[PDB]
């Protein structure tokens, strides 16, 4: 389809991950995997070969930068802060790709890449958990963007409702062939 944006200089964070929906295209997965190397292909209810054969109504790809060592934190069944307050995966539609992208392909690595570690709210200390296929709320992100990188829990007031949020970076865990995560769902 048009995958010139998937492999572009801006590499999105977990707190603010990016995605696209591709329609009315002839897919070319065999090039995507030739342009960048893949270390792991982990997918339920579908196979690496199945995704390369046949046309589908809609293709959705979500992506963000993320260190390999933390791969278990995106696992199904995980109760980690990374998956709970930022990126919940959609398991209602059949693939997590761990792919190192060579510095020869203009992808940069700049900015304090981060994810939300906590986002409570109200007198219930109720948590603000991200629904599968969704994104962290504007209120959680706005607070987190003004937090220290040391993970302190700070109070904010958003529209009359109190929130206690914290943010933690992983800006240090980078390599020239930076490790990125892509998630593919096929309709």
């Amino acid at each position: 389809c048009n995958f010139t944006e998937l492999f572009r200089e801006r590499a999105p964070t977990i707190m603010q991950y990016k995605r696209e929906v591709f329609t009315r295209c002839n897919y070319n997965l065999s090039l995507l995997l030739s342009l960048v190397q893949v270390d792991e292909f982990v997918c339920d209810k579908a196979t690496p070969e199945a995704l390369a054969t046949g046309c589908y109504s809609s293709l959705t790809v979500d992506w963000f930068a993320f260190p390999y060592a933390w791969k278990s934190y995106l696992a199904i069944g995980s109760a980690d802060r990374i998956v709970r307050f930022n990126y919940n995966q959609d398991y209602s539609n059949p693939c997590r790709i761990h792919s190192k992208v060579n510095s020869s392909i203009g992808i940069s690595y700049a900015g304090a890449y981060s994810y939300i570690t906590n986002c409570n709210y109200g007198a219930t200390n109720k948590d603000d958990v991200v629904k599968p296929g969704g994104r962290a709320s504007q209120q959680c992100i706005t607070g987190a963007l003004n937090s220290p990188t040391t993970g302190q829990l700070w109070a904010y007031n958003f529209g009359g409702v109190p929130y206690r949020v914290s943010r933690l970076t992983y800006t240090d865990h980078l390599s020239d062939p930076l490790d990125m995560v892509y998630v593919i769902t096929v309709k």
Binding site: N120, A123, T124, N125, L153, A155, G160, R164, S166
Partner: protein, 680 residues
């Protein structure tokens, strides 16, 4: 023109007082919500600003004499702001009294008691109370009880005696007879007609009330004693006082923990619904929103949005440290919050209502002038919260609410178990509070000589409460200061009055709601008429005599145990059948007197030599056998004595404490060793 300038002064005070109260109360809230040195500093600074404000205003307040004030609310507000308190003390005495107060608090707080036989195991106060509430070992319970008295009591003694004098001098500087009146003055008020109450009949009301609830306490005493005798065999006599260390706590203020040894119908389950609440998927918010539903169906106030947004209803898992002790907060500017760590339990279900009820009262008097924004008195605040708690504790509520099975029915065995547990909580503590303040008042007044403080403490305690010391004590001890409230200068009588008011309020409200049958089965849910009467009284705050507030809801200006006795009527009758003629107790007996010997007559050094000779005689008696016991003069215990006339004694093993060697054994131990008891 005094009336007019006093008016302007108070209006000015009240305006800034509310603004500053908000800053201080909020800083304190934020600190407890989120614990850190930074917030502790903000809290301390905000509190310092408050004190400077209040103190400066109390200086100007002296320019507005009460003599020329005809308005009741100006009169009351000036009386509150004008008091000097500790400030009429000179700098030396003020500083010394503060130092003594702080030292007394510290000795109590970090007091420790170690195991006398195995002194590598030692407990802090909270560790000691855990042992004291749970153990059934007569020996362990005794060294915990006795240890605390010698480790903490005796260290507090030298401070209390100076303390009493300085507190009395402070009170005299405020135009009181002594410190007793300083405290009793919290109930004093002068209204119109019969709404005029003297601080000097508080003593009259508590003595009268105490006597009317004596029959109920005597029935409870005989029952608990008869049952407790099977937990601690041949330690407790058929008739007499209970040993202090077997009462289920460090001070014996509640018989709450004796319930498990005293259950009327032990095989029967009590009522709660913790398992049901989990099955029905309850949580914090549900628990509090259900409590609001209750207050609304009674006809009082609904909660504000700030409460639901601003409070702490659950324990956080964010990484923040907090203190979970339940407290209702009023931060000013009509900002009402609850700070509690709620979980799906019967205890939190009912506590949530208690804290909610305090807020309902806080709202009602919000309309009052700043200094008058409190309840009618010390007792009304909790008395109201307790009534509103009883209303939902009852299974009548729990069933109507849909939490209990609709096939749920109330047995006449379950009724007895419930009432006894309540009696151990209420009936059992009433005599403790009464006796403590009875003694305390006499000490500050000056009716008990310093040298007779402990003598009267234990004599009076056996007469009123029916508790006796496992071991005799000298005047080096001061067991009264063993309790937090004495050591830290708190009034205790509020615990007596809140109970009496609680039942006066409950009964009047039930009658208004047209309740028929026993009061312990009363409910005020879906009774707007009972709701309206309660609201009118709560709204008064301190603008009227507390006897006025009492008259509106209970139709009298005096306190009566009348309603308490009716609450427990079915228990009284049940206990009577169980106790027969074992009703009441004697104050002649003590745990160590049965085996004592009497000595007829004397210097303290001669008493030492006597005790040394007795210890020697015991050593010789045992030496003849093949058991060696290292008895010393210290192991001979001396009972109440009459100087230069007579004394009594007994001896115990240095490695057990709880044991007393039988009179006959001690007596011929002395006879065998009759020779070689001479000197020079």
């Amino acid at each position: 023109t005094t009336e007019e300038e006093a008016r302007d002064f108070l209006d000015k005070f009240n305006s800034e007082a509310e603004n500053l109260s908000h800053e201080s109360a909020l800083a304190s809230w934020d600190y407890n919500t989120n614990i850190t040195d930074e917030n502790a500093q903000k809290m301390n600074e905000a509190d310092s600003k408050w004190s400077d404000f209040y103190k400066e205003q109390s200086k100007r307040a002296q320019a507005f004499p009460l003599q020329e004030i005809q308005n009741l609310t100006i009169k009351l507000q000036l009386q509150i702001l004008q008091q000097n308190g500790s400030s009429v003390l000179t700098a030396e005495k003020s500083k010394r009294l503060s130092t003594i107060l702080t030292t007394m608090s510290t000795i109590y707080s970090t007091g420790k008691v170690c195991n006398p036989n195995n002194p590598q195991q030692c407990f802090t106060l909270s560790g000691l109370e855990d042992i004291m509430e749970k153990s059934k070992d007569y020996h362990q319970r005794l060294w915990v009880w006795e240890g605390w008295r010698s480790e903490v009591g005796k260290q507090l003694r030298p401070l209390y005696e100076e303390y009493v004098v300085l507190k009395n001098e402070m009170a005299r500087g405020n135009n009181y007879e002594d410190y007793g009146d300083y405290w009793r003055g919290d109930y004093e008020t002068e209204g119109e007609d019969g709404y005029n109450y003297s601080r000097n009949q508080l003593m009259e009301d508590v003595d009268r009330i105490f006597l009317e609830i004596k029959p109920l306490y005597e029935q409870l005493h005989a029952y608990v004693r008869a049952k407790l005798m099977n937990a601690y065999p041949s330690r407790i006599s058929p008739t007499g006082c209970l040993p202090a260390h077997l009462l289920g706590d460090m001070w014996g203020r509640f018989w709450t923990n004796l319930y498990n040894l005293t259950v009327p119908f032990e095989q029967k389950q009590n009522i709660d619904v913790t398992e049901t609440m989990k099955k029905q998927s309850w949580d914090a918010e549900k628990i509090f929103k259900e409590a609001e539903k209750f207050y609304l169906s009674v006809g009082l106030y609904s909660m504000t949005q700030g409460f639901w947004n601003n409070s702490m209803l659950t324990e956080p898992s964010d990484g923040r440290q907090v203190v979970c002790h339940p407290t209702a907060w009023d931060l000013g500017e009509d900002d009402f919050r609850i700070k509690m760590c709620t979980k799906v339990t019967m205890d939190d279900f009912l506590t949530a209502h208690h804290e909610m009820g305090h807020i309902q009262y806080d709202m009602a008097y919000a309309k009052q002038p700043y200094l008058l924004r409190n309840g009618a008195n010390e007792g009304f605040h909790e008395a109201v919260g307790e009534v509103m708690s009883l209303s939902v504790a009852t299974p009548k509520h729990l069933k109507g609410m849909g939490l209990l099975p609709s096939d749920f029915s109330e047995d006449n065995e379950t009724e007895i178990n419930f009432l006894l547990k309540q009696a151990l909580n209420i009936v059992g503590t009433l005599p403790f509070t009464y006796m403590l303040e009875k003694w305390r008042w006499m000490v500050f007044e000056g009716k008990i000589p310093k040298e007779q403080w402990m003598e009267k403490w234990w004599e009076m305690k056996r007469e009123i409460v029916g508790v006796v010391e496992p071991l005799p004590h000298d005047e080096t001890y001061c067991d009264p200061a063993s309790l937090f409230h004495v050591a830290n200068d708190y009034s205790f009588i509020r615990y007596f009055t809140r109970t009496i008011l609680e039942f006066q309020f409950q009964e009047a409200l039930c009658k208004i709601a047209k309740h028929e049958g026993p009061l312990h089965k009363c409910d005020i849910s879906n009774s707007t008429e009972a709701g309206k009467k309660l609201k009118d009284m709560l709204e008064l705050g301190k603008s009227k005599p507390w006897t006025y507030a009492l008259n509106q809801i209970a139709r009298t200006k005096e306190m009566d145990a009348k309603p308490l006795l009716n609450y427990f009527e079915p228990l009284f009758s049940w206990l009577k059948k169980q106790n027969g003629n074992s009703v009441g107790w004697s104050a002649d007996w003590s745990p160590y007197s049965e085996q004592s010997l009497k000595v007829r007559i004397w210097n303290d050094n001669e008493m030492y030599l006597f005790r040394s000779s007795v210890a020697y005689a015991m050593r010789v008696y045992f030496s003849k056998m093949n058991k060696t016991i290292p008895f010393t003069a210290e192991d001979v215990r001396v009972s109440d004595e009459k100087k230069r006339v007579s004394f009594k004694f007994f001896v115990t093993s240095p490695t057990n404490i709880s044991d007393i060697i039988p009179r006959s054994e001690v007596e011929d131990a002395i006879r065998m060793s009759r020779s070689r008891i001479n000197d020079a």
